Amino acid sequence: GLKLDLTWFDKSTEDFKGEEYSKDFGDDGSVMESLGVPFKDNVNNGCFDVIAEWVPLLQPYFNHQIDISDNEYFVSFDYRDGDW
Amino acid sequence: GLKLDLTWFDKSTEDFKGEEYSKDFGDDGSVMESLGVPFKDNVNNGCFDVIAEWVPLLQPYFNHQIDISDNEYFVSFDYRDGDW
Amino acid sequence: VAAPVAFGFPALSTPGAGGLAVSISAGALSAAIADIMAALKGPFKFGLWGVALYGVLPSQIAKDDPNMMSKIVTSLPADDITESPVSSLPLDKATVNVNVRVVDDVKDERQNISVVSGVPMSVPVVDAKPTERPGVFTASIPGAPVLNISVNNSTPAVQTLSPGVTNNTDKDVRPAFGTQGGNTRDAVIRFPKDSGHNAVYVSVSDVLSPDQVKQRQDEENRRQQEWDATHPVEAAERNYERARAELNQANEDVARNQERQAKAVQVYNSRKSELDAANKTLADAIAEIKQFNRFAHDPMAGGHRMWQMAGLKAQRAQTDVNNKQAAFDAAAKEKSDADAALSSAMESRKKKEDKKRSAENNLNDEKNKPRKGFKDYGHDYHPAPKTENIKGLGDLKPGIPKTPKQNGGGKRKRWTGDKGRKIYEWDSQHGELEGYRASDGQHLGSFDPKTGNQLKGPDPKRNIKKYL
Amino acid sequence: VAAPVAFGFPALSTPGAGGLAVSISAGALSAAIADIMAALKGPFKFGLWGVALYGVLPSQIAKDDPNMMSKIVTSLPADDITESPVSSLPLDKATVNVNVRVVDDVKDERQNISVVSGVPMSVPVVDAKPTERPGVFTASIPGAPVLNISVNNSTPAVQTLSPGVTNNTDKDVRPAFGTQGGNTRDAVIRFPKDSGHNAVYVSVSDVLSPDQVKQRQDEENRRQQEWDATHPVEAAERNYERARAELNQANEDVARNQERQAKAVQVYNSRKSELDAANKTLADAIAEIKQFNRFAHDPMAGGHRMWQMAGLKAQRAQTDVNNKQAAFDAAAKEKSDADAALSSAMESRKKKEDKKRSAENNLNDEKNKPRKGFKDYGHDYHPAPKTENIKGLGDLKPGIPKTPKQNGGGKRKRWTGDKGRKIYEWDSQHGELEGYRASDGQHLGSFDPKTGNQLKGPDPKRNIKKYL
């Protein structure tokens, strides 16, 4: 049960501003392939920084307007068997 | 009064075979010019040997059949003022 | 006044000079040109493919100005005047996209393939003049659109700095999406309720500089190389397709060369015999002058004329043979260079012809063999704990990642603590937390989320005073 | 049988191979060819001029055979069946004449000019067969003529060894008259009284050899050089006419060369710009390949095709410019050689242009000055005495001259004496006889013809044991 972890902080105070989880994608690695991040050593092991180019492809899954000019965004591909 | 002196001998015994004078040509050097012999140092001073090429031009003046295959011929251009 | 609106236009590339960017779209149904979207959407393997629309290049003035390639909404998965609460909407294709394919700024390309996509919705506000409206797209210039029914646009081939002469084929495209450019796709269609209203999709991409382009391809290459390593399973194939046309290439060569050796021996024989002729005319003209030399030192003989004439005959006859000689020689050169450059193709060919083999059976040598899937990759690392499920350490406020992992590519999960004194980070390697003093940055120990119980004391060696 | 008679013929050159020489003249009125006699007789300054009829040259077999160029009598100053007593008759023209003009055996030439001429008359005798008759011309082969009414002759261009391609102009001719050849002119027309009778003039000249020809021109030159000295009065003119055409020559040169420099600069500009073109097509083809190199290391991009294509465009575009280069260069060469060879004519011309001057005013420098005539030359030497008028020494039998004079060219008058013991010789220098002993050859003294009285005794120094 893979999910996308999105967290963001203020582009100045570095303060935690928020975090929203994504729907589960079961074993659909796809989302990762659209971003280019390889499965190897990245599933449940890493917190990549969301880069502009990515917004357009991530946004489709987070009820959150990714204001990348007002906040810093990061994403992690967490995966747990079953539901959660 | 120029004249042509023609003398001939046997092409073997060298014996005098004959001599005939020519008509006078007065001052008509011409005959000499047809033969090529220059006036200078040749008038009354020389006895040239008649060479074949010449027969045809000399003959016209000597009642003698110039048998150049049976005799040797020689010619001198003698010149005396007046008649003789 | 405000945005100095300009010349209307349909769905082309529009270089505006920074200032404030103003857009004046000349309303009309999508043109058949930008219709490539059709062939694009053509059901392909899941991915994000695209098509180079226009091309960018060495423009003009020493100032930076982007291209506001707008174009009506025909990209929305379904549109309506939805509720204001939503600031992001999907779309099947995103236009304006700085994609640096082979070696330049693709002023636009066709992003629309098997890959979901959402975008912003700025609702335009009224303004002073009649039909002008600021539609401030979050990341770039404000830009005030000016939609107009009167279909009188700008037909002239796109402004100078943008040649539509792009290899209009259909291929794929990485990050490069809006890097240094694109970053604009956003349906602004939300015009009031009584104005030039319409579903419009404007996207502003920045006209990259020569350097930046390089500063772009490189990265594109960086990420390509990396993924390549992670995916040998295919890369070899990406390596085979590279050898296929490689040989396909060396053949078109060996051919077009055989042709050269052709026209070679062709102009040889011709120019060759063309010469032989001259020699002959010359010889005669020569042997003729001999047939009369005897009259040479005989200035007055008439036959001396003959001699004189043969002199002139041969001179000319000679110079002819001269040029005839040049011609022939040159021919003999090309004739050679040819015969040799051909064997080259012959050599080159074999080299390639083989290498494909060393890239074809080597494909199975990484295709044939068993690889495993996503589900496995998931089990390779103990799953991080939910901030709110981290127990016994007080409260926790996640914090910007900064600690470089060891393998992979992202940082380690960090969360503040002790009102900002104690830092924690998930160690996915053994499945356990790790403490670090704020100021110091030194390791305080390893605790357990369920509880917060230590399991290991401070280790002075371990510390990470590497993150503010 | 006798003379193996052969193919009839009119008045052409007829190479018979030694054997016995047989002639078969095909009766007919003089042809218009050999009609040059007409223009020849054309009243010229007193002299012996002529016209080359035919030409002689490197024949065939290693044997000697002459040409029996016969031709009816149209050369007799008046003919009739005169009295047998006369063996020599005049004629206005003599055919067969080995004249070695410029450098070869003139198998015949037109001797007929202002110069009297007589010839032999052999009366032909009957023979075995019907119309054949031996007509033994004193100096050469017998030859039996065979005149025939049936005008069927030999039209084929004169037998091989004799080309009618002679410079048919009208000029003068020295000794060379029958030397080693000619020596045959003799009207044989005296056929019996009832046979193939007719006024025929046959002349047999010997087909000189390459050497003999040289052995002939040389002498011709010898005698020319000599006379030249004796006659400076004119020779200078013979020297001027040599300078006139000399310059006339150098001009036709400077001209035909200006022409070369013409066609020179002509094919230059043409071939020059013809090249410039190629460079341009090449440049572009080149700058084009640069416009696409970027796609070079991109085997799979399509734009790589463009690059590949521009490669091939320029290759060809290059080789074109190659040949264009050859052409141009060669041109530039001839263009040069020309521009230089012209100034030469320019140089040469002046050299000649002047020399004529140094041969024109130098003419008067030996024309203007007073010379004297024949009558004078006559008085320069005391006239020899008539053998029969030589008095007081007994009888005298003239004897072959052998004593070289001192100046002039002939020997001294010699006459035998004393029944062949005493020799005398006229000394035209002082006008007196001179005695020489036979055997010894020593000078006996000086006597006087009138009388025979000595006037000077023996001088041992003086002797002439130089004559058998």
Curated annotation (Swiss-Prot), chains A, B:
Domain of life, source organism:
Bacteria
* Pfam families referenced in this protein's UniProt entry, alphabetically: Cloacin_immun (PF03513)
What are the UniProt keywords, alphabetically?
Answer: Bacteriocin immunity, Plasmid
- Recount the UniProt induction comment for this entry: Probably induced by SOS-stress.
Instruction: Keyword check for Ion transport, yes or no.
Output: no
Keyword Flavoprotein among record annotations: no
Biological-process GO terms, alphabetical: bacteriocin immunity
GO MF annotation: an example: toxic substance binding
Instruction: Show the InterPro entries listed in the entry.
Output: Cloacn_immnty_fam (IPR003063), Cloacn_immnty_sf (IPR036528)
Q: Record's Gene3D superfamilies?
A: Cloacin immunity protein
Q: Which proteins does it associate with, and in what oligomeric form?
A: Native colicin E3 is a 1:1 complex of A chain and protein B (Im3). Binds between the translocation and cytotoxic RNase domains of intact ColE3, blocking access to the 16S rRNA substrate. Forms a very tight 1:1 complex with the cytotoxic fragment (residues 456-551) of ColE3 (ceaC).
Domain commentary: In complex with the cytotoxic fragment of colicin E3, Im3 residues 39-45 move outward to form a wide hydrophobic groove at the top, which interacts with an alpha-helix of colicin E3.
What does this protein do, in the record's words? The cognate immunity protein for colicin E3 (ColE3), protects cells which harbor the plasmid ColE3 against the toxic action of ColE3. This protein inhibits the 16S RNA hydrolyzing activity of ColE3 by binding with very high affinity to the C-terminal catalytic domain of ColE3.
The record's similarity note reads: Belongs to the cloacin immunity protein family.
By what name is this protein known?
Answer: Colicin E3 immunity protein
Q: What is the organism of origin for this protein?
A: Escherichia coli
From Swiss-Prot, chains C, D:
Q: Recount the UniProt induction comment for this entry.
A: Probably induced by SOS-stress.
> Which residue ranges does the record annotate as region Receptor-binding (R) domain?
233-367
Transmembrane stretches, by residue range?
none
* GO MF assignments: endonuclease activity; lyase activity; ribosome binding; rRNA binding; transmembrane transporter binding; tRNA binding
Enzyme class name? lyase
Q: Residue ranges of region Cytotoxic RNase (C) domain?
A: 374-468
One BP annotation, GO = negative regulation of ion transmembrane transporter activity
Q: Where in the cell is it found?
A: Secreted
UniProt lists compositionally biased (Basic and acidic residues) regions at: 213-237, 347-389
Region described as Ribosome inactivating activity: spans on this chain:
372-468
Q: Does the keyword Cytoplasm apply?
A: no
Q: For the motif Hairpin, what are the positions? A: 296-302
Q: Where is this site: Stabilizes positive charge on His-513?
A: 427
State the residue spans of region: Linker: 368-373
Note the effect listed for residue 462 to A.
1000-10,000-fold diminished cytotoxic activity
Q: Which domain of life is it from?
A: Bacteria
**Outcome (variant: residue 430 to A):** Complete loss of cytotoxic activity. Nearly complete loss of rRNase activity in vitro
E.C. number, please?
A: 4.6.1.-
State the oligomer form and interacting partners: Native colicin E3 is a 1:1 complex of A chain and protein B (cognate immunity protein, Im3); protein A is 1,000-fold more active in inactivating ribosomes than the native complex. The cytotoxic fragment (residues 456-551, C95) forms a 1:1 complex with Im3. The receptor-binding (R) domain binds obliquely to its receptor BtuB without displacing BtuB's central plug; binding unfolds the R domain. The N-terminal 83 residues (T83) bind OmpF; trimeric complexes with colicin E3, BtuB and OmpF can be cross-linked and immunoprecipitated.
| Record protein name field | Colicin E3
Species for this entry: Escherichia coli
Quote the range of the complete protein represented.
84 to 551 of 551
